[PDB]
Amino acid sequence: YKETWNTGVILLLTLMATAFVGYVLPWGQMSFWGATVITNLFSAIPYIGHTLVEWAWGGFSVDNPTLTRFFALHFLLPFAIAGITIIHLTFLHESGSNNPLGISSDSDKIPFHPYYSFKDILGLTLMLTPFLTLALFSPNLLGDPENFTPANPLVTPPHIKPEWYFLFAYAILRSIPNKLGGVLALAASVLILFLIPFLHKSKQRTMTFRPLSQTLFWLLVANLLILTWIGSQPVEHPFIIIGQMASLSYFTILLILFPTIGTLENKMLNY
Amino acid sequence: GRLMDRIRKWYYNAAGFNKYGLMRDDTLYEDDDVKEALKRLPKDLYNERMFRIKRALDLSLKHRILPKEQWVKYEEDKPYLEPYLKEVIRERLEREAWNK
Amino acid sequence: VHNDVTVPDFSAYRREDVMDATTSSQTSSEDRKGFSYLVTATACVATAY
Amino acid sequence: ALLRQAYSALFRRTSTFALTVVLGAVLFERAFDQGADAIFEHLNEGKLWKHIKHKYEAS
Amino acid sequence: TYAQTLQNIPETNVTTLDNGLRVASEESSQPTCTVGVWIGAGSRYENEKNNGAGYFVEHLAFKGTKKRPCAAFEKEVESMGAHFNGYTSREQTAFYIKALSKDMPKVVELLADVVQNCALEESQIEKERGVILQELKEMDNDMTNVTFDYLHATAFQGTALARTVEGTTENIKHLTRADLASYIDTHFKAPRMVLAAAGGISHKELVDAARQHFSGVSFTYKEDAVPILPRCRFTGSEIRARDDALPVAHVALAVEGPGWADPDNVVLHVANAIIGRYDRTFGGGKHLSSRLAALAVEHKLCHSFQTFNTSYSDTGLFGFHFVADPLSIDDMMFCAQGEWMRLCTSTTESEVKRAKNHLRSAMVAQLDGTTPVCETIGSHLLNYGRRISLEEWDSRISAVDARMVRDVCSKYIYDKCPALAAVGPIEQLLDYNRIRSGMYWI
Amino acid sequence: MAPNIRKSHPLLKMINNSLIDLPAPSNISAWWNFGSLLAVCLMTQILTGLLLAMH
Amino acid sequence: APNIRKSHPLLKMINNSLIDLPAPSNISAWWNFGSLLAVCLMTQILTGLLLAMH
Amino acid sequence: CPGAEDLEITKLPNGLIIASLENFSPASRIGVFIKAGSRYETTANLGTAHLLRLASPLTTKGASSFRITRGIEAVGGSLSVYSTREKMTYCVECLRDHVDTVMEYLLNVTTAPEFRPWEVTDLQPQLKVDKAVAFQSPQVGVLENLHAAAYKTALANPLYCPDYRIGKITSEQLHHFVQNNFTSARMALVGIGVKHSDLKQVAEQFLNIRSGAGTSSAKATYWGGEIREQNGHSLVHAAVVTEGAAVGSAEANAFSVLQHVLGAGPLIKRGSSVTSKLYQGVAKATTQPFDASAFNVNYSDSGLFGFYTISQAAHAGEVIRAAMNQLKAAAQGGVTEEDVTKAKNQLKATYLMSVETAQGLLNEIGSEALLSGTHTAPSVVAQKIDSVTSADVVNAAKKFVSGKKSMAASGDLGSTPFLDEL
């Protein structure tokens, strides 16, 4: 469902950007050094590089102007997300929801209400429990403590790692030992989602009926888990090499192993 | 030797769409060609394909499968569509190369 | 009948170059348009700036 | 005829119409700016720093 | 071979009489044949007071002469099996007879007798008056035509071309023996008439008859002069006749044509072949080669549509007419204007290769029988000023290629204010501007 | 006109045309839930967000 | 199908509410304020952010 | 460089008649005439003839619905099917240098149709349409009824699939209609602008479907009844006829002459046609606009003959009655030995002009070339025409007033008469 999907990706991208700015507001040590490293990422583009950054910071280095405009950004973006979510959902409604078996379902559909309105209220409470359980019994588990120290533009902390949801990226950016390479690898580490739709070779729609693909799929998941962990670790042996591999393997499973297994599969059904 | 055959048969039981009573061609993703083919299906063959799916869907919703004795067997699987499809495709392939 | 019907007189509003029902309107087109198009094209420049 | 030559080589092909507004505006700006600046610096003679400048610009 | 069967067709012969008449004909072997006088007359030559002469005449040209009244005329003709028919456009009237090559002479005599010694009985006119008036209450319900007239009526608006051939209701109610006379007198003159025929006739044998009945030589240079006509101004515009009570709606769009002479008309017809025409019954269906035809089918766009290249002495109309349901006029119009653009911007060598071969055989079928072959000569001499052989027509077509078309169509279509005429329950189509806007880019 | 006021109201029709009468595969699993959660998630961040931004 | 201005679930909107929108052939200038108000809003918001950024 | 030629006509073993004729026109026109039609239809498979006619563009074992249309349009060709109650005619036209290719399809269409279940059911709704257009002419509505009101079978079957059967015809039904009719012995491969040495090489080396009269047609039983259709319409159409002659049966030429003797159409635009007994005969009774003429059809094992009127509803009666009295006063020595001499030219003429249009010629050559595998020179036909006596005519006119008559109408038949009142 290409359109429903592509919007999805844009959405993800926005959320990613949104959290980034939100995180800087508290103006902690990370906030800062985070704000300093991430924006600096655009400085990888040649020509309009160093210059683009300037708007970002609103200066010649991170300072107030940055902070206030980030607050503006953060205040605004969410709404944009809510807006695109409308497009996302609106596109979806032209085709109906997909389904686990990957075959027509017209032959039997049911009203969202009360079948799914009820299924969801429950789903919501099943996820709400852990999330409250953390935010009520272990508030700081997922959060770095280094950020309890007011930003100091003079001292970058020794043990620096982004909040968990950015580790895989982090790991890849750290995998390639080149300003640009890292950036690019990064850029594509996510931008690749746009390709998934054109890398579909199986005659069937879901994996439910493709054990091969399935194994490869879970291999990818786990592959991701590692990359995350690797981001949690410092640049040293073995980690460096492990990171490097996992990245290669991430990109490869997506760009070559899926399409290749996908085809092979068909021939094994005699299509 | 009987390798390919040995293989195919395995994969077939592997994918396991039989567990749901679905023939190989029931699980085909419906692109434009397939859509077209399905419309060319003889009244009954279609009404039958229909049931099978509306029945498989009912299963997936209940989370259950068919008792062992009602599963499709690799050799008794009828490719009721493969021929109609190859024709749609062979037909299309023409229109396309002819527009040059 | 569809015969007792004729296009009224649009001379009050016609552009001078095509007011005489005996001269091809095709010679004086290049202009009639080049102009209105020049107004247009200019406005576009004004906007741009 | 200018208008005809105009309509033929410019306002006709939608592609060149645009190409004109561009190269066109360009000149317009460059020119307009000068005028207004001049019409202004003229209406305020001897009052702008650009006029007083030499009384302190040790040169 | 095609190329050769083309050059065997007997060169068409021509000779003039020192009075203005011109005689031509193509000899064959057929025992039967057709002959006729092709007058360069019509409503285009009429004025505000006499709109309806060429018609009122065409109506009495078959009710007798002074030599042999009503019965006698018909009787003598029927009794030899010949067929006498005629017509009268805006700028070309014609009277012609089909009969056995044996009666070649006796025929010409008759033709010469209608054109020159037309009866015009006062009892007959006041009778053909009530009839024309009827052929109107009827011709009025032929939308296709109610439209094409309106198209003229505003495309050439204000000029003479912009008139109905059947003429006004008032005129046909008041024309007088007198007025009819003049029309005949002032218009049916030898230097402007053409004796054409085809069949198993000898050229000499034909002309000979002419010399005998189409005599009456002239004295002053005045009589040997072809009155040149006042140009007709094209005017981009529209005329909308609404009646949501009609089943379908007819629309017709057009640009100013080039005029008979122009060698471009060839290119244009080659184009018009690319888009061709379509109509409900076409067994072709979704596989037809005409993009518009195809789309027209795919989306139930219209009951029928057609391309046309009406040509005249100095000008002409070029466009298309389609009939559709009140709820598809739009989509249709749109698809069309697009195909027009496509022409001007990306016509391919294949699109034209086919178009050519089509036009080719269309023109060949224009010469299917004696009557139509004749009509080709009557019209050729009177318009082109000679006879254009299929060998020629063909070569002129073999010349056309993509580039050619693209330039010509751009030349006559691209960004031109169009003439629009719509009839029926036409609400869905609604804007000259918007339409104008559809005359460029695509 | 229209009978019930849930299909003809240019507003109410929407909550009913996209959240109630909406046709859904009789068999979508739990992995289809995240859709909503993500929405409730957004709508919720925004609340805590303003409340926060107010200080 | 046919044109991509009436079947695109997005483009159709800008075309279904801003181009093919049927309007009385005779609304005056007191009907213009509608848009202006809109342009006014969108415009305030721009200067607004720009400002809020300082 | 070209000149004159001769008309050849071979006849293969299986019975496939081949008629050639090179007239060096820049364009050829090949065709396949066949003893087919809605005369071999049984109650159970009606209209299957009709649909078969529109099913012409449908895929064959050697060409797709697509490639057939695009392949033919690519050369500026044309493909059309023409059929009577008892004869189908498939024929393409085109330029000489292309005939080669247009043939493949002409062949494939008539010899190897696949009649795919879908292409078919997807084409049936057309019948509803194709039929609706034709019927805009009341001219055709009254003819359908006549035939059915003048017959018990075969010829009584309608030319346009009846309404009830639209959409119920099958692929099976079509097929058995081809396998059982389009057999080599009922087929004729007639062609113009072609070398007989080629129009031949095709028929034999390429044609298949075996021979045999396939399925004989139900002998035409004459009925003779009336069908009156009240429809409120402004004009009343009507045709009263009686068994006429058959095809090639000397006794026809008489009617064919008695046809012209009563006036069978106009020859002068907006005319009065005095050489028309019938016409003139009616004008001397009616005051308002009307029209009447001589009806005449010749079928292999039967035929019809009479007159056809059209008039305002109020005068409908007298106009028809006058149509009769004018036929009696004609069946009783009121035919000048000279009227007969005239109708002979009109007939010699009409015929002769029908050979002008390539289409008109390919039809004369064909009909003959299929019903006998012969071709009667134009001087022989004109001979069998004047070989008519004033008696044969006065008799034709008599064979009418005695036998059982069949009638057909349509319109406000409020003041129109019944058959039993003539």
Ligand code: HEM
């Ligand atoms: C704020 C962003 C997002 C929100 C709140 C959101 C919400 C939704 C909702 C409500 C659904 C329907 C129910 C469901 O199937 O879960 C949906 C469907 C879907 N979304 Fe998202 N979405 C978001 C992000 C994305 C992203 C990042 C992707 C992936 C690039 C994506 C891809 C899809 C797709 C493919 C579907 C189809 C569902 C199906 O398979 O039936 N969405 N989304």
Ligand code: HEM
């Ligand atoms: C788009 C969904 C949202 C996401 C993903 C998000 C995420 C975050 C993050 C990562 C932080 C830093 C939290 C921390 O200090 O540990 C934050 C802070 C903040 N966000 Fe949001 N936020 C969202 C929406 C908003 C909105 C809509 C507002 C209100 C316009 C808002 C207002 C703030 C404020 C005031 C802070 C600073 C105070 C604080 O750090 O607690 N946020 N947000």
Ligand code: HEM
């Ligand atoms: C809804 C349309 C808007 C109206 C009617 C409006 C009106 C105003 C008014 C009355 C003021 C005080 C102006 C003054 O100091 O003289 C103001 C200030 C301000 N507005 Fe807005 N505003 C609008 C939208 C916004 C938006 C969308 C933002 C950005 C979220 C914004 C940001 C600001 C800022 C930063 C100030 C304070 C600085 C200043 O006073 O110049 N405004 N606005």
Ligand SMILES: COC(=O)CNC(=O)CCC/C=C\NC(=O)c1ccc(Cc2ccc(I)cc2)cc1
């Ligand atoms: C939640 O915020 C954070 O975790 C930000 N804080 C930090 O990254 C703290 C440490 C700063 C140092 C290095 N960071 C990175 O190299 C880094 C690299 C990539 C990303 C992902 C990301 C990219 C663009 C964009 I736009 C967003 C994300 C995020 C961080």
